[PDB]
């Protein structure tokens, strides 16, 4: 068995190896990369996402989200308060203001300490889930807007044509902006490219130990757990590495820097935070290996969890479809 400790692996593809996306994901998995739930891919030195990021200030963040926390420092929930629209230019200025800027710190470790100590006492603003792409049309390798669609993968594996499209999303971050503990919709893969700016720190639980995190989450968020069988789908729960360690939950951490890809694997619970102003692009994808995870994925049917999903539940989980559809 490759990667038995479930360590987060870092890959350095050659330009030749960067030419076939599916092939390289399969290669990574042949080395046990998936067992960690998360992998870093450093692109070839001659590769670039686009020419410059000098012309992105006029992008609109239609609904910036202020992330308001409740609970204790190491165990909290966050809700999203809608704010008025602003451009990326205006958001960048806000991120860099005294109120929101990254504080002085010695290193990544110091910054992590400051995040978990202080996160709940501030409410940063996040430009999340903006449909669009910053990859240049002429970028032919690992262009997140030119990946094979999940609908086409499902069709190729299961022989059924389905409706739906899947397109990339942009995420404009600032210091303390947070992504809560979750797996992807239908336990899909995700790929995330950090286009520009300050780093993003990730935490991840190995897929083979996902149910351990769920069990702890039910204990730590008893109210939310009673309300919904798969409340982590709401993407509101944060648990610190110190608390995970106290409870014996296996996990790993890694910091992603500008110009680097991260891939999350089926049923790999993950969470994290941004160091400062940055922009990431992400999309879900599937491989043949995903199908069996899709079949087993837990669903939020309470209504809280946030189009393409219909067909995946309909085909892969026909028994769950009616009840799930009532929640929607």
What residues numbered 109-148 form the site for ligand N5J, per CB under 6 A? 128
At 6, list the tokens. 């479930």
Q: Phi and psi at residue 156, in whole multiples of 5°? A: -65, -35
Closer residue to ligand N5J in complex, CB, 25/194: 194
Q: How far is the CB of 122 from ligand N5J (least distance, A)?
A: 17
Q: How far is the CB of 236 from Co ion (least distance, A)?
A: 14
Contact with ligand N5J (CB under 6 A) among 192, 240, 252, 298:
192
Q: Which of 289-328 are b and which e, b meaning 16 or more Cβ less than 10 Å from the residue's Cβ?
A: ebeebbeebbbbbeebbeebeebbbbbbbeeeeeebeeee
171's contact among ligand N5J, Co ion, Zn ion, none, with CB below 5 to 8 A by partner kind, is ligand N5J
Which residues lie across from 238 on neighbouring strands?
Answer: 76
Q: How far is the CB of 195 from ligand N5J (least distance, A)?
A: 11
Contact with ligand N5J (CB under 6 A) among 91, 171, 193, 265:
171
How big is the site for Zn ion, counted in residues (CB under 5 A)?
A: 4
238 binds ligand N5J (CB under 6 A): no
Residue 39: burial class (beta carbons within 10 Å; 0-12, 13-18, 19+): buried
Nearest 10 degrees: Cα torsion 67, 233, 209, 148 = -100
* Closest CB to ligand N5J: residue number: 179
Q: How far is the CB of 293 from ligand N5J (least distance, A)?
A: 16
Q: Which of 185-207 are b and which e, b meaning 16 or more Cβ less than 10 Å from the residue's Cβ?
A: bbbbbbbbbbbbbbbbbbbbbbb
User: What separation in angstroms does the CA of 137 have from each of 52, 56, 59, 143, 294?
Assistant: 13, 15, 17, 8, 31
275's contact among Co ion, Zn ion, ligand N5J, none, with CB below 5 to 8 A by partner kind, is none
280 binds ligand N5J (CB under 6 A): yes
User: What separation in angstroms does the CA of 278 have from each of 148, 188, 253, 289?
Assistant: 26, 24, 19, 32
At 218, list the tokens. 């039910």
Residue with tokens 């609908």: 151
Contact with Zn ion (CB under 5 A) among 6, 125, 216, 300:
300
Q: Which residues are part of a known binding site? A: 126, 182, 184, 192, 200, 228, 234-235, 270, 300, 302
How big is the site for ligand N5J, counted in residues (CB under 6 A)?
A: 8
At 323, list the tokens. 């009840």
Q: Which residues are part of a known binding site for Fe cation? A: 182, 184, 270
Residue with tokens 């992603």: 256
For residue 207, give the 3-state DSSP assignment: helix
Which window, 31-39, 147-155, 189-197, 255-263, contacts Co ion (CB under 5 A)? 189-197
Closer residue to Co ion in complex, CB, 24/267: 267
309 binds Zn ion (CB under 5 A): no
228's contact among Co ion, Zn ion, ligand N5J, none, with CB below 5 to 8 A by partner kind, is Zn ion
The per-type count for the chain, helices as H runs and strands as E runs, is 10, 16
Binding site for ligand N5J (CB under 6 A): 128, 171, 179, 192, 200, 270, 280, 282
Q: Which residues bind Zn ion (CB under 5 A)?
A: 228, 300, 302, 304
Q: Report the interface residues with Co ion, using CB under 5 A.
A: 190
């Amino acid at each position: 068995a490759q990667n038995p400790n479930c360590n987060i692996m870092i890959f350095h593809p050659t330009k030749e190896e960067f030419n076939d996306f599916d092939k390289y994901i399969a290669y990574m998995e042949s080395q046990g990369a998936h067992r960690a739930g998360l992998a870093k891919i450093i692109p070839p030195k001659e590769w670039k996402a686009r020419e410059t990021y000098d012309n992105i200030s006029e992008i609109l963040i239609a609904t910036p989200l202020q992330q308001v926390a409740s609970g204790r420092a190491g165990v909290f929930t966050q809700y999203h308060k809608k704010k008025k629209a602003m451009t990326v230019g205006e958001y960048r200025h806000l991120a860099n203001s005294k109120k929101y800027q990254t504080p002085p710190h010695q290193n990544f470790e110091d910054l992590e300490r400051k995040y978990w100590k202080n996160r709940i006492y501030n409410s940063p603003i996040y430009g999340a889930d903006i449909s669009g792409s910053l990859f240049d049309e002429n970028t032919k390798q690992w262009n997140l807007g030119h990946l094979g669609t999940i609908q086409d993968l499902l069709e190729k594996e299961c022989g059924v044509v389905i409706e739906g499209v899947n397109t990339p999303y942009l995420y404009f971050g600032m210091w303390k902006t947070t992504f809560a503990w979750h797996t992807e919709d239908m336990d899909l893969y995700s790929i995330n490219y950090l286009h520009l700016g300050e780093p993003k720190t990730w935490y991840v639980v190995p897929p083979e130990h996902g149910q351990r995190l769920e069990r702890l989450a039910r204990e730590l968020f008893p109210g939310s757990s009673r309300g919904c069988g798969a409340f982590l789908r709401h993407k509101v729960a944060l648990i610190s590495p110190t608390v995970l360690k106290e409870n014996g939950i296996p996990f790993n951490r890694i910091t992603q820097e500008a110009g680097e890809f991260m891939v999350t694997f089926p049923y790999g619970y993950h969470a994290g935070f941004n160091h400062g102003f940055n922009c990431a692009e992400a999309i879900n994808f599937a491989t043949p290996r995903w199908i069996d995870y899709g079949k087993m994925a837990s669903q939020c049917s309470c209504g809280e969890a946030r189009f393409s999903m219909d067909a995946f539940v309909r085909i892969l989980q026909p028994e769950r479809y009616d009840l799930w559809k009532r929640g929607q």
